[PDB]
């Protein structure tokens, strides 16, 4: 068996070499519809609109995780923890 | 030449709200800049809406939607209420 870290590095390389989506389409669609229900009842959605929402969400989360990793390395650790996310968002100005 | 500004109207509103308080020149300039910036933001949003919907005219509906898009929460709610009341009063009289 491999020591911890090798499989993580291989996964990092694999997912940085490819460009496909990483979130399940049907759960994402259900979440989008549930969120949209609070604003107007009985709406309809285009598949392209759902796809664009998914692309934007994944790009935003990837950027946020990059900033979180930078914070975690700055704090002399290799594990990302929620206060890193909080600091990153506070400095970005979203909270 | 003349230089138009909102100083008189700002002073009228200030006297309506706090009858016994004055305002300095720097504060009045800040208020004028604030009013101009908000005007520009709302007008730009309304123009973009009208261009998006293939319309040639800007209406109170476009202004209302721009206000909803720009102002947050309770500010947008009360601003919409005041705008609707003013439009209704102007149309009735």
């Amino acid at each position: 068996r491999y020591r911890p870290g090798t499989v993580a590095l291989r996964e990092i390389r694999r997912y940085q070499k490819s460009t496909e989506l990483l979130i399940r389409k049907l759960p994402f669609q259900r979440l989008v519809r549930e969120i949209a229900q609070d604003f107007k009842t009985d709406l309809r959605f285009q598949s392209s609109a759902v796809m664009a929402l998914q692309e934007a969400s994944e790009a935003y989360l990837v950027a946020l995780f990059e900033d979180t990793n930078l914070c975690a390395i700055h704090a002399k650790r290799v594990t990302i923890m929620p206060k890193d996310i909080q600091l990153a968002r506070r400095i970005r100005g979203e909270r | 030449t003349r230089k138009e500004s909102y100083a008189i109207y700002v002073y009228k509103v200030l006297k309506q709200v706090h009858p016994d308080t004055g305002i300095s020149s720097k504060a009045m300039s800040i208020m004028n800049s604030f009013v101009n910036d908000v005007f520009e933001r709302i007008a730009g949003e309304a123009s973009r809406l009208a261009h998006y919907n293939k319309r040639s005219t800007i209406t109170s509906r476009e202004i209302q939607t721009a206000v909803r898009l720009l102002l947050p929460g309770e500010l947008a709610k009360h601003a919409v209420s005041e705008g609707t009341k003013a439009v209704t009063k102007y149309t009735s009289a």
Partner: protein
């Protein structure tokens, strides 16, 4: 034919006519409606009234009688929605809100 201002017609303090002229001359659309200046003037007046009320409260809490940029900055940065609206705006001669991290403060 007595002249009655549109601001008095709609019960507003703001210059409806001037707002209409600025909308016409600003290159926003080919034509503008009739109620758009009234709506925009009402919104501007409401925002101005909110700001002025908060600033006046802040100023006379300090026991002064003149609104100053410090009072304006205090009002804006202490009202949550106003601060969100003006997040990217810098007010001259405003200073900063007093705040010190508790870690820096000694305790028991």
């Amino acid at each position: 034919a007595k002249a009655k201002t549109r601001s008095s017609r709609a019960g507003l303090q703001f210059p409806v006519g001037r707002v209409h002229r600025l909308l016409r001359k600003g290159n926003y659309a080919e034509r503008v409606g009739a109620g758009a200046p009234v709506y925009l003037a009402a919104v501007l007046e409401y925002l101005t009234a909110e700001i002025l009320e908060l600033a006046g409260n802040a100023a006379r809490d300090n026991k002064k009688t003149r609104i100053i940029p410090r009072h304006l900055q205090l009002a804006v940065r202490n009202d949550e929605e106003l601060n969100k609206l003006l997040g990217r705006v810098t007010i001259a001669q405003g200073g900063v809100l007093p705040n010190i991290q508790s870690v820096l403060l000694p305790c028991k």
